[PDB]
Design an enzyme around this catalytic site. Structure first.
Site, PDB file in Angstrom:
ATOM      1  N   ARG A   1       8.842  59.477  56.515  1.00  0.00           N
ATOM      2  CA  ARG A   1       9.910  60.481  56.508  1.00  0.00           C
ATOM      3  C   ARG A   1       9.529  61.558  57.507  1.00  0.00           C
ATOM      4  O   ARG A   1       8.546  62.276  57.308  1.00  0.00           O
ATOM      5  CB  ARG A   1      10.092  61.056  55.098  1.00  0.00           C
ATOM      6  CG  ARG A   1      11.187  62.094  54.982  1.00  0.00           C
ATOM      7  CD  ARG A   1      11.337  62.547  53.541  1.00  0.00           C
ATOM      8  NE  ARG A   1      12.304  63.634  53.412  1.00  0.00           N
ATOM      9  CZ  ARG A   1      12.079  64.859  52.930  1.00  0.00           C
ATOM     10  NH1 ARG A   1      10.878  65.260  52.507  1.00  0.00           N
ATOM     11  NH2 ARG A   1      13.089  65.720  52.884  1.00  0.00           N
TER      12      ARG A   1
ATOM     13  N   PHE B   1      11.098  70.364  61.225  1.00  0.00           N
ATOM     14  CA  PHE B   1      10.742  70.566  59.820  1.00  0.00           C
ATOM     15  C   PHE B   1       9.318  70.053  59.583  1.00  0.00           C
ATOM     16  O   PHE B   1       8.384  70.841  59.586  1.00  0.00           O
ATOM     17  CB  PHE B   1      11.800  69.922  58.899  1.00  0.00           C
ATOM     18  CG  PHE B   1      11.534  70.058  57.405  1.00  0.00           C
ATOM     19  CD1 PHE B   1      10.710  71.056  56.867  1.00  0.00           C
ATOM     20  CD2 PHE B   1      12.164  69.184  56.524  1.00  0.00           C
ATOM     21  CE1 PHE B   1      10.503  71.147  55.494  1.00  0.00           C
ATOM     22  CE2 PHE B   1      11.961  69.276  55.155  1.00  0.00           C
ATOM     23  CZ  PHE B   1      11.131  70.263  54.645  1.00  0.00           C
TER      24      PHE B   1
ATOM     25  N   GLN C   1       6.052  63.426  57.197  1.00  0.00           N
ATOM     26  CA  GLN C   1       5.512  63.093  55.882  1.00  0.00           C
ATOM     27  C   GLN C   1       4.980  61.665  55.847  1.00  0.00           C
ATOM     28  O   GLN C   1       5.568  60.762  56.429  1.00  0.00           O
ATOM     29  CB  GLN C   1       6.613  63.281  54.841  1.00  0.00           C
ATOM     30  CG  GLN C   1       6.210  63.010  53.402  1.00  0.00           C
ATOM     31  CD  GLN C   1       7.303  63.365  52.416  1.00  0.00           C
ATOM     32  OE1 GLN C   1       8.221  64.115  52.745  1.00  0.00           O
ATOM     33  NE2 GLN C   1       7.195  62.857  51.184  1.00  0.00           N
TER      34      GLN C   1
ATOM     35  N   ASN D   1       5.399  66.432  46.878  1.00  0.00           N
ATOM     36  CA  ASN D   1       5.429  66.283  45.428  1.00  0.00           C
ATOM     37  C   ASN D   1       6.833  65.961  44.952  1.00  0.00           C
ATOM     38  O   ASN D   1       7.782  65.981  45.742  1.00  0.00           O
ATOM     39  CB  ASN D   1       4.814  67.516  44.736  1.00  0.00           C
ATOM     40  CG  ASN D   1       5.623  68.794  44.930  1.00  0.00           C
ATOM     41  OD1 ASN D   1       6.843  68.790  44.779  1.00  0.00           O
ATOM     42  ND2 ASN D   1       4.941  69.908  45.210  1.00  0.00           N
TER      43      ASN D   1
ATOM     44  N   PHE E   1       2.335  66.188  54.055  1.00  0.00           N
ATOM     45  CA  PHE E   1       3.120  66.432  55.259  1.00  0.00           C
ATOM     46  C   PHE E   1       2.443  67.411  56.185  1.00  0.00           C
ATOM     47  O   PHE E   1       1.648  68.244  55.755  1.00  0.00           O
ATOM     48  CB  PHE E   1       4.563  66.868  54.951  1.00  0.00           C
ATOM     49  CG  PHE E   1       4.693  68.128  54.128  1.00  0.00           C
ATOM     50  CD1 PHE E   1       4.559  68.087  52.742  1.00  0.00           C
ATOM     51  CD2 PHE E   1       5.029  69.336  54.721  1.00  0.00           C
ATOM     52  CE1 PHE E   1       4.717  69.228  51.971  1.00  0.00           C
ATOM     53  CE2 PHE E   1       5.170  70.488  53.957  1.00  0.00           C
ATOM     54  CZ  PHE E   1       5.024  70.429  52.577  1.00  0.00           C
TER      55      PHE E   1
ATOM     56  N   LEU F   1       8.771  76.779  51.210  1.00  0.00           N
ATOM     57  CA  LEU F   1       7.915  75.917  50.410  1.00  0.00           C
ATOM     58  C   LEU F   1       6.719  76.627  49.773  1.00  0.00           C
ATOM     59  O   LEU F   1       6.018  76.021  48.955  1.00  0.00           O
ATOM     60  CB  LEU F   1       7.457  74.716  51.248  1.00  0.00           C
ATOM     61  CG  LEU F   1       8.599  73.873  51.825  1.00  0.00           C
ATOM     62  CD1 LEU F   1       8.049  72.730  52.660  1.00  0.00           C
ATOM     63  CD2 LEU F   1       9.556  73.352  50.764  1.00  0.00           C
TER      64      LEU F   1
ATOM     65  N   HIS G   1       4.606  73.814  47.165  1.00  0.00           N
ATOM     66  CA  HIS G   1       3.709  72.777  47.694  1.00  0.00           C
ATOM     67  C   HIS G   1       2.359  73.398  47.973  1.00  0.00           C
ATOM     68  O   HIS G   1       2.294  74.516  48.478  1.00  0.00           O
ATOM     69  CB  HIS G   1       4.314  72.189  48.976  1.00  0.00           C
ATOM     70  CG  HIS G   1       5.589  71.446  48.727  1.00  0.00           C
ATOM     71  ND1 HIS G   1       5.616  70.097  48.462  1.00  0.00           N
ATOM     72  CD2 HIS G   1       6.869  71.872  48.623  1.00  0.00           C
ATOM     73  CE1 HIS G   1       6.860  69.714  48.232  1.00  0.00           C
ATOM     74  NE2 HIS G   1       7.640  70.773  48.326  1.00  0.00           N
TER      75      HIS G   1
END
Ligand code: EA4
Length: 164
Positions: A54, A59, A62, A101, A112, A121, A125
């Site tokens: 991903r 951004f 991952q 998560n 990531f 975040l 995270h």
């Protein structure tokens, strides 16, 4: 001192290069140790051969689902999941290394690498490291992502380990 680990990354079988990461064992020892051991493969499982599944431009990238290869899986060296250790480190900018998560206290192996400041975040995270060398490689990975997260090339961690 803090461990240095590496990921060697290929895209469609062509080497992209190496990403070197400092793990902040001084701040998040349990989280750092999990990642370190998954890089060496010393427990008999780990990241070698797994994919960046991903990748979303502007951004993050991952990776780390070595059980299911689709972002549903992975496991830690402690068990299936382990708790959020602390939220002391923040998502300050590109190159931050943080745990993926599925809600509170569901850390496994997925992680990531941020390509922008992802301040939203913070407190959700666990941040546990940052890129030392190889942001150019991370930007290459980012370039093969899309809005949906689907990658246009197969991005594989072909080797990984500990440098110090
Ligand atoms: C920018 C980070 O975005 C996420 O973490 C979105 N969540 C996500 O992909 N969750 C799937 C998942 C399942 C099990 C474990 N252990 C970890 C993650």
């Amino acid at each position: 001192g803090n461990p240095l680990v590496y990921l060697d990354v290929d895209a469609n079988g062509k080497p992209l290069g190496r990403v070197v990461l400092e793990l902040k064992a001084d701040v998040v020892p349990k989280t750092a140790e999990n990642f370190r051991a998954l890089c060496t493969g010393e427990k008999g499982f780990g990241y070698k051969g797994s994919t960046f599944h991903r990748v979303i431009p502007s951004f993050m990238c991952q990776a780390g689902d070595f059980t299911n290869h689709n972002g549903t899986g992975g496991k830690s060296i402690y068990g299936s999941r382990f708790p959020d250790e602390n939220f002391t480190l923040k998502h300050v900018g590109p190159g931050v290394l943080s745990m993926a998560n599925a809600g509170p206290n569901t850390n496994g192996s997925q992680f990531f690498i941020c390509t922008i400041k992802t301040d939203w975040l913070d407190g959700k995270h666990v941040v546990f490291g940052h890129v030392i060398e190889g942001m150019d490689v991370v930007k290459k990975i980012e370039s093969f992502g899309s809005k949906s997260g689907r990658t246009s090339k197969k991005i594989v961690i072909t080797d990984c380990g500990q440098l110090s």
